[PDB]
């Protein structure tokens, strides 16, 4: 009381529950006090960040250095969460997700470390999660069958019929299969391996799909015994919870059983090359557009150790000056050259490895131009050495960091442990990464003392560095087909080596695993919260709405934004002609990048980066809460700035609204070719989303509109525009959109700032609103109470549709959508509970555990759309069959009252998630939900009973009772192709 204040009372040398205080440092710019502790007996390191933040986070970190691409530290990370000595029950992790009110619960495996973080606002929940995490990581039951499920296994297509052929299955096996569906991730992986070929960075830490089955159960157990010793661990906490409680728990449960060892886990320094290297690799074809401009090329430079914190901080800043924004050297040299479509993957500073590295290059080039690019990179470096950087860009970059430092997030503790992990992993000082005020200061001093400081740095690490790597990638049209071929051989090689005794054990063990996944077991050894631990009411959000200039509503919300101002504006699309609708996302993406007034796009970019934290526009479809076929369509303008630069931001908005430059045609093609490239590369990672959006297009007008704005239709459209030889006819569409959008006719605004700043904002905002012009196509328009004008399509008829996108993927993405009821319907709360209920107790088991898919479940949206989905699924038909078996299971009522409570806990853990000061209260501003509506809906979630779950499952999810929509992203499926009820695109 307070948290950062109490931490300063700790004396150096203080002994606390087996720990010793080694250092206490105040970091006022982050409102926290850092405390370093060491465990006396084990030598385990501890970092505690004391800050008055209720969202407390714990994390434990292990240095994991694999020497093969089996993915053993990744599979181990999955497997240690499958059972422990104190909690021997099956799957403690996934069970605790529904027995807690956490804000975060997960695990990650980097190249050379594994991280287990969780966060919660409930102190009792913290202890519960702390006991389960400590026991899982240090004392796991590493049962053979849990390894077969999460890693890889041999299994009959029907585990009960030993005459069926044996196949590969596993969660990680399919997790990594789909991970390398992303070509950028393929490129990124090979870059690191070729650039750092000496030690653990030369392998695939996550797992190479072809090398995963080379992993034995024994190697998994040996790897754990070698790397998961507390002497090889980093402990981390953040928040207001008493530190003493943590240390007492960590010591008495786990650390007490160990004694100091010297971990054989150090990553040696990469020995620098005397001569540069070139490598050529291959990837998968394009999804799904065009065929010669598809080569990716990159040049990479080896940098010093990240444990040298200031030089790392320096080179990271230098890396932003070199590649970030249209004023960066490599942007003008590579992007504006028209040779490619976008930067190569992993552009800029990469500080995950011990030695960081810099990369720059292009994708979407013709293979003949590879030397052209390399020469440009060569020429650009020479010019930077000779000319250096302008001071206003250095000021702009330092202004951005200032914003990143002052901004208030809800997952601050998670970002901090992630931001220090690499440095800490190699025995660096994580606290020195926190003193950003010092690094900024020293950086400024280093510039004032040496005007050629940055020029000599580029000279050292780019012009004189012989440790250069040139890597080029060209796609192979049969890449995944070739992969399957080798996979089929390794499979046969593994089956051939099986003895008759081996074959019986695989049958029996496989049958035992299937039994484990089906048999309902007890989880009472696990700690748990109850529904009584959920707060009955929410804290009221205080607002005041003022009509301004002369009847535009502006919403003011006083918040501890720490000297930050957040401005938002929403302009309706009701006056816009329907012909121009598909071009609105494109419009919004270039509106703030084409120049305004006397500012060209270069000059405009300089101001935005120097005065604001960013200004963006995006199209939104906001469904009504009481009518499925009612929605609000518009564009959300969002901007952010420091207290002092507020007038500049609103002046920028005024000029963008009154004089945007829709004439910069050359830069326009660059932005379009870049947006299209980025959209196509991100399809696999968001495949289930693109599947869900298509599946729901035929169910709701809003769903139909969302498909136009961000569906595959939008991806396909953007690609066509980027293929256009004459871009002018698209460019002429923008002024037409401008005259309907950029005015004050159909507008409302919101402001989030400190109460001390509020009166100053009321002026600048009001001045902005008066500087924009003043004075609907669809039947009808509804007025809904301070008035929003919504589009109603009361003759909308939902229609069943099934779609299969033929993608060259090794995995599938399935989505099934059902039209239910909206937010204010009492059955909506039941459906919300049911969705998580089905996920926790059915779909997760069928699709993920048995199937081997990486993700699978059900969710219910605000728009009343019930969606079932699978993510990186080796199956398609069997997945859909599981969708049907899930609703039949839901109708059977064969679930307990405890399962309902666990579903409630899971739901409230999501809706009661912490809200950043910048986002309160966007729910009122966007969807028009009062505190009254939310409390009513909150108490309905409380009143949800078993009979209401049976009634609502039979009322909406049954076959023929409601309208369904289906979509699949994945390779060709003969069964689907012979079904006339499926459409192939």
């Amino acid at each position: 009381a307070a948290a950062c204040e109490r931490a300063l009372q700790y004396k150096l040398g203080d002994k606390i529950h087996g720990f010793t205080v080694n250092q206490v440092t105040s970091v006022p710019e982050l409102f926290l006090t850092a405390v370093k502790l060491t465990h006396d007996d084990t030598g385990a390191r501890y970092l505690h960040l004391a800050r008055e933040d209720t969202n407390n986070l714990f994390s434990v970190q292990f240095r994991t250095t694999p020497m093969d691409s089996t993915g053993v530290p990744h599979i181990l990370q999955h497997t240690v969460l499958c059972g422990s000595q104190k909690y021997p029950c099956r799957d403690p992790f996934f069970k605790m997700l529904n027995r807690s009110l956490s804000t975060f619960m997960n695990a990650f495996t980097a190249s050379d470390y594994t991280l287990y973080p969780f966060s919660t606002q409930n102190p009792k929940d913290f202890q519960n999660l702390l006991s389960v995490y400590l026991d899982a990581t240090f004392f796991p039951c590493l049962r053979e069958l849990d390894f077969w499920q999460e890693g890889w296994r041999l299994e009959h297509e029907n585990p009960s019929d030993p005459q069926t052929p044996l196949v590969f299955k596993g969660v990680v096996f399919n997790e990594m299969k789909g991970a390398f569906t992303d070509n950028e991730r393929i490129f990124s992986q090979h870059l690191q391996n070729r650039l750092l070929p000496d030690h653990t960075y030369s392998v695939v830490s996550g797992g190479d799909p072809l090398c995963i089955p080379e992993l034995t159960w024994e190697q998994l157990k040996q790897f754990h015994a070698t790397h998961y010793h507390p002497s090889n661990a980093r402990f981390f906490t953040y928040g207001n919870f008493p530190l003493e409680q943590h240390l007492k728990q960590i010591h008495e449960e786990a650390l007490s059983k160990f004694q100091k060892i010297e971990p054989s886990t150090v990553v040696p320094a990469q020995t620098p090359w005397d001569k540069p290297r070139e490598f050529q690799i291959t990837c998968g074809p394009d999804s799904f557009a065009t065929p010669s401009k598809q080569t990716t090329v990159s040049v990479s430079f080896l940098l010093p150790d990240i444990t040298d914190t200031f030089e790392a901080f320096t080179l990271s800043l230098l890396s932003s000056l070199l590649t970030s924004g249209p004023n960066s050297p490599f942007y003008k040299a590579l992007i504006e050259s028209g040779l490619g479509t976008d930067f190569s993957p992993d552009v800029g500073y990469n500080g995950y490895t011990r030695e960081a590295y810099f990369s720059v290059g292009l994708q979407g080039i013709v293979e003949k131009d590879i030397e052209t690019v390399r020469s440009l990179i060569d020429r650009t470096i020479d010019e930077v050495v000779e000319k250096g950087f302008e001071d206003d860009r250095i000021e702009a970059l330092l202004h951005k960091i200032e914003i990143q430092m002052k901004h208030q997030s809800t997952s601050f503790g998670l970002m901090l442990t992630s931001y220090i992990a690499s440095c800490w992993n190699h025995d660096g000082d994580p606290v020195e990464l926190l003193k950003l005020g010092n690094q900024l200061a020293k950086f400024r001093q280093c510039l004032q003392e040496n005007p050629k400081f940055l020029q000599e740095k580029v000279k050292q690490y780019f012009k004189n560095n012989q440790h250069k790597l040139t890597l080029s990638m060209r796609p192979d049209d049969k890449y995944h087909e070739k992969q399957a071929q080798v996979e089929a051989t390794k499979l046969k090689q593994k089956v051939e080596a099986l003895s008759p005794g081996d074959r019986q054990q695989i049958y029996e063990k496989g049958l035992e695993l299937r039994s484990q996944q089906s048999k309902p077991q007890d989880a009472s050894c696990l700690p748990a919260l109850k529904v009584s631990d959920i707060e009955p009411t929410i804290p009221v959000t205080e607002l005041d709405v003022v009509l301004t200039a002369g009847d535009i509503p502006v919403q003011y919300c006083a918040q501890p934004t720490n000297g930050m101002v957040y401005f938002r504006a929403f302009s309706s699309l009701n006056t816009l002609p329907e012909e121009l609708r598909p071009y609105v996302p494109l419009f919004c993406s270039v509106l703030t990048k084409l120049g305004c007034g006397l500012l060209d796009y270069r000059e405009q970019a300089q101001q935005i980066e120097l005065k604001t934290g960013g200004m963006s526009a995006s199209p939104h479809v906001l469904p009504d809460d009481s009518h499925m076929d009612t929605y609000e369509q518009g564009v959300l303008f969002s901007s952010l700035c420091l207290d002092r630069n507020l007038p500049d931001m609103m002046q920028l908005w005024s000029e963008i609204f009154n004089n945007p430059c829709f004439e910069e045609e050359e830069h326009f093609k660059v932005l379009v070719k870049m947006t299209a490239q980025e959209l196509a590369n991100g399809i696999p990672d968001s495949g289930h989303l693109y599947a869900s959006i298509r599946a729901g297009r035929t169910l709701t007008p809003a769903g139909d509109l969302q498909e136009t704005f961000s569906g595959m239709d939008q991806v396909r459209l953007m690609k066509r525009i980027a293929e256009m030889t004459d871009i002018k006819p698209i460019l002429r569409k923008l002024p037409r959109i401008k005259k309907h959008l950029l005015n004050g006719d159909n507008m409302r605004c919101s402001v989030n700032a400190t109460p001390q700043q509020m009166p100053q904002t009321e002026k600048a905002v009001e001045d902005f609103l008066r500087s924009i012009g003043r004075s609907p196509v669809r039947p009808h328009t509804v007025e809904k109470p301070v008035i929003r004008k919504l589009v109603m399509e009361p003759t909308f008829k939902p229609w069943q549709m099934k779609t299969h996108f033929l993608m060259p993927f090794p995995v599938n993405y399935v989505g099934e959508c059902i039209r239910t009821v909206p937010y204010t319907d009492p059955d909506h709360a039941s459906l919300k509970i049911l969705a998580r209920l089905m996920t926790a107790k059915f779909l997760h088991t069928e699709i993920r555990e048995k199937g081997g898919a990486y993700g699978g479940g059900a969710k219910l949206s605000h728009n009343g759309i019930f969606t079932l989905y699978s993510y990186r699924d080796p199956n398609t038909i069997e997945t859909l069959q599981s969708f049907g078996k899930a609703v039949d299971w839901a109708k059977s009522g064969k679930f307990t009252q405890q399962d309902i409570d666990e579903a409630k806990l899971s739901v409230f853990s999501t809706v009661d998630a912490p809200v950043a000061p910048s986002d309160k209260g966007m729910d009122h501003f966007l969807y028009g939900l009062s505190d009254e509506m939310k409390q009513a809906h909150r108490e309905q979630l409380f009143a949800v009973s078993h009979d209401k779950l049976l009634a609502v499952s039979d009322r909406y999810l049954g076959t023929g009772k409601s309208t369904h929509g289906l979509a699949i992203l994945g390779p060709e499926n003969p069964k689907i192709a012979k079904d006339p009820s499926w459409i192939i695109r």
């Binding site: 990370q77 996934f94 997700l97 956490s102 804000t103 990650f108 997790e175 992986q189």
Partner: peptide, 9 residues
């Protein structure tokens, strides 16, 4: 709750 499935590369 959150972040159900566990990563990464």
């Amino acid at each position: 709750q959150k972040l159900v499935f566990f990563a990464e590369d």
